[PDB]
Write an enzyme that holds these catalytic residues in place. Structure first.
Site, mmCIF file in Angstrom:
data_model
loop_
_atom_site.group_PDB
_atom_site.id
_atom_site.type_symbol
_atom_site.label_atom_id
_atom_site.label_comp_id
_atom_site.label_asym_id
_atom_site.label_seq_id
_atom_site.Cartn_x
_atom_site.Cartn_y
_atom_site.Cartn_z
ATOM 1 N N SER B 137 2.854 19.802 -3.193
ATOM 2 C CA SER B 137 3.006 18.958 -4.404
ATOM 3 C C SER B 137 3.495 20.344 -5.545
ATOM 4 O O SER B 137 2.146 20.325 -6.239
ATOM 5 C CB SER B 137 2.821 17.131 -4.348
ATOM 6 N N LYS B 163 7.604 19.384 -2.218
ATOM 7 C CA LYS B 163 7.598 17.602 -3.199
ATOM 8 C C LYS B 163 7.915 18.054 -4.574
ATOM 9 O O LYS B 163 6.486 18.610 -5.338
ATOM 10 C CB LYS B 163 6.609 16.574 -2.985
ATOM 11 N N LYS B 165 8.195 16.226 -8.631
ATOM 12 C CA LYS B 165 6.941 15.055 -9.651
ATOM 13 C C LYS B 165 8.572 14.555 -10.042
ATOM 14 O O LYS B 165 9.366 15.780 -10.765
ATOM 15 C CB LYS B 165 6.169 15.224 -10.076
ATOM 16 N N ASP B 190 9.302 12.410 -6.341
ATOM 17 C CA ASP B 190 8.398 11.411 -6.133
ATOM 18 C C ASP B 190 8.304 10.481 -7.427
ATOM 19 O O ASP B 190 8.512 11.273 -8.410
ATOM 20 C CB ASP B 190 7.086 12.044 -5.876
ATOM 21 N N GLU B 215 10.357 9.334 -3.240
ATOM 22 C CA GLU B 215 9.152 8.108 -2.707
ATOM 23 C C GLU B 215 9.182 7.765 -4.709
ATOM 24 O O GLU B 215 9.220 7.670 -5.848
ATOM 25 C CB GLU B 215 7.670 8.912 -2.727
ATOM 26 N N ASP B 240 5.404 3.730 -0.367
ATOM 27 C CA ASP B 240 3.660 3.883 -0.392
ATOM 28 C C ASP B 240 3.092 3.254 -0.520
ATOM 29 O O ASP B 240 2.965 2.535 0.573
ATOM 30 C CB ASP B 240 3.760 4.999 -1.380
ATOM 31 N N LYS B 264 -0.183 7.612 4.505
ATOM 32 C CA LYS B 264 -1.685 7.585 4.437
ATOM 33 C C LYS B 264 -2.646 6.745 5.046
ATOM 34 O O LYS B 264 -2.647 5.539 4.786
ATOM 35 C CB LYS B 264 -1.625 7.418 3.244
ATOM 36 N N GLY B 292 -1.038 12.439 1.582
ATOM 37 C CA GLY B 292 -2.508 12.612 0.863
ATOM 38 C C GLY B 292 -3.230 11.728 -0.026
ATOM 39 O O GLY B 292 -2.509 11.275 -0.598
HETATM 40 MG MG LIG Z 1 3.487 7.031 -4.888
#
Ligand SMILES: [Mg+2]
Ligand SMILES: [Mg+2]
Lengths: 371, 371
Positions: B137, B163, B165, B190, B215, B240, B264, B292
């Site tokens: 990420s 991933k 951001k 994300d 996400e 999430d 998660k 994670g």
């Molecule tokens: Mg999130």
């Protein structure tokens, strides 16, 4: 405009006249905290932490919530200059959940402002009523006969609304009994998340009893199954647990999960939040009423000021201390006058602490310098 | 069949190589707890409390969660005889929320059983893989140029998935840059709840970059706005925060809030729960992958066993300790072998505690008798 000099966290526990049954427990008393926020000009604001001892209602608990208050909420006020009591929801905005902790602190800040403005907390949030019609809740009875006797006592006492506790084996037969006997008494049913979709037949059979509403038949986080049920009934469905904010109501609304909302100050994060929700329900035909959480004197005083708003029409779950507690921690006891309670007119929440009565129920005292 | 003799709660804090940015904070380390559950036959089960220090992710916090563990979860095991590790979710079932507290304790119970059965925790939950493709990420970059440099390092390092951001001012321009440069690299974005409905234009402009998933664009409790967006995109939407159980996935599904789930262990309450969700996503075309939470050695070991399941295809958020920590508290360090981690084969979670390394990062130790 004010700064909070210090905070005083008082842990007390009041003996309940009769045991209170929760989902996976039974209360013998009301274990709570009193958040005393002290101004820099000498004004004392009071809030009450309502979180139950076990996470069998919502995720919050008294021990964990008061922990969040100490470690998370009070440090934010430390520095700060507060201009509107509503600024409180904002600085706590970044905090996820933990509504009952926020409420205890935020409601204290409101009381502190209404005090500063020499107004009732009720006057301040704009209420006009001077008394409010409160209701009464009856748990599960083994006899239909005995339920009807209990129902009779209250009606004669003045209670204009009765909440009947419902459950799969004890539901339809009791509602009739009460409906076919008090054909004009507003009546609602609370199903405490005891049903599944498979029981929609049972639930549909209640539609024809002019039930004011049926509270949370399904899951405490559910929106979907509730909506699937609401569309099949005339009676309104009422959410409780999963309603934490206007945003939460908005979802329940667009999904069609309910037609009524059980609004409890603590569970919703405070006053700012509660009013926003009341206003919204009013604009979208959603029935709103004040639920309860076995509040001590301070909790009840705030609740009654909220209840005084015009949006609230349905009688809330408020009552004279004498219904639950042998004694309370607030000087001007609440007198029941035929289904009605007098809205405080004194500055702030309108009531004072019996520092005397309190002392004998206080388990610990902690002062925190927010400066 | 086993009984838990005692529990040992170890509070440790590991220095992060680089600061970790959270929503309303910045971590400098991983403050966590190690739940050591000790059998009556001498077997030690290990779990890790992942809750962040501030309630800026979910409502839980390390201090409040470990409080719930002590006051709520451990007392339940005290008496009890446990036959299946999955019996743990059940006796904790009546508890609302508090998933990360449950997880720390429940994952310990699983490790204890896999140990008893001389199997890997991975072997036991049924996994077959022996290695898993982990991703990487990247936070927000000021330069598009510098993002592309970072993206280059990892790809060459073997990471088969990245991933990125995202955020309103730094979104579309970066995705291109990376997509129009690594046309075959699986890439997701994300959005950390940084958008509103009003930004659907921005979000629609990403659909055409073959983004694996986006996400949580909207609210951390939202289902509705997510669904309203999902129906307008080809790319999958990933939830999430509000995904705590199969039941939660079921709602998101019927509402059409997403097409992918960031699973998660901690946030979902444990192993029993995680598998139920994985199985469900598999049966309903919902993409599932292991997110994670900056796990120390113990947390990571469990995460890798979950990730070894067949349902998880998309690379998860797991990595060699060396990416975050200078040192870890688990003896067999995780070696990165071109985007892959070796699944433990040793009994239980497959790794041991450097009681040495631990000691110098331990802040307190507490033993609790369960007999
Ligand atoms: Mg999130
Ligand atoms: Mg309820």
């Amino acid at each position: 405009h004010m700064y909070f000099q210090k905070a005083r966290l008082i842990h007390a526990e009041l003996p309940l006249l009769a045991p209170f049954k929760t989902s996976y427990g039974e209360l013998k008393s009301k274990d709570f905290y009193i958040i005393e926020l002290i101004n820099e000009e000498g004004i004392h604001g009071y809030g009450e932490l309502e979180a139950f001892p076990l996470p069998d209602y919502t995720e919050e608990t008294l021990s964990s919530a008061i922990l969040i208050i100490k470690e998370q909420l009070l440090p934010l006020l430390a520095q700060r200059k507060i201009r509107k009591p509503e600024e409180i929801q904002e600085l706590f905005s970044w905090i996820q959940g933990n509504e009952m902790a926020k409420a205890a602190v935020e409601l204290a800040v409101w009381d502190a402002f209404a005090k500063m403005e020499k107004r009732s907390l009720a006057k301040m949030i704009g209420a006009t009523k001077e008394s409010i019609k409160v209701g009464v809740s009856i748990g599960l009875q083994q006899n239909v006969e005995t339920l009807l006797q209990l129902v009779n006592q209250y009606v004669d006492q003045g209670y204009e609304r009765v909440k009947l506790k419902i459950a799969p084996n004890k539901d339809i037969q009791f509602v009739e009994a009460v409906r076919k006997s008090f054909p004009k008494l507003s009546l609602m049913a609370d199903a405490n998340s005891a049903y599944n979709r498979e029981d929609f037949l049972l639930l549909k059979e209640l539609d024809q009893y002019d039930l004011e509403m049926i509270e949370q038949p399904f899951g405490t986080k559910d929106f979907v199954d509730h909506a699937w049920l609401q569309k099949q009934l005339k009676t309104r469905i009422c959410l409780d647990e999963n309603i934490r904010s206007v945003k939460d109501v908005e979802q329940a609304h667009s999904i069609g999960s309910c037609r009524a909302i059980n609004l409890k100050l603590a569970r919703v994060g405070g006053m700012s939040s509660a009013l926003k929700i009341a206003e919204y329900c009013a604009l979208n035909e959603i029935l709103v009423w004040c639920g309860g959480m076995l509040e001590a004197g301070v909790g009840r005083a705030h609740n009654i000021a909220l209840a005084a708003r015009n949006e609230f029409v349905f009688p809330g779950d408020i009552s004279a201390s004498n219904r639950f507690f042998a004694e309370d921690i607030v000087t001007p006891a609440f007198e029941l006058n035929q289904g009605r309670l007098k809205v405080p007119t004194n500055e702030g929440i309108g009531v004072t602490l019996d520092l005397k009565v309190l002392k004998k129920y206080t388990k610990s005292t902690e002062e925190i310098l927010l400066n």
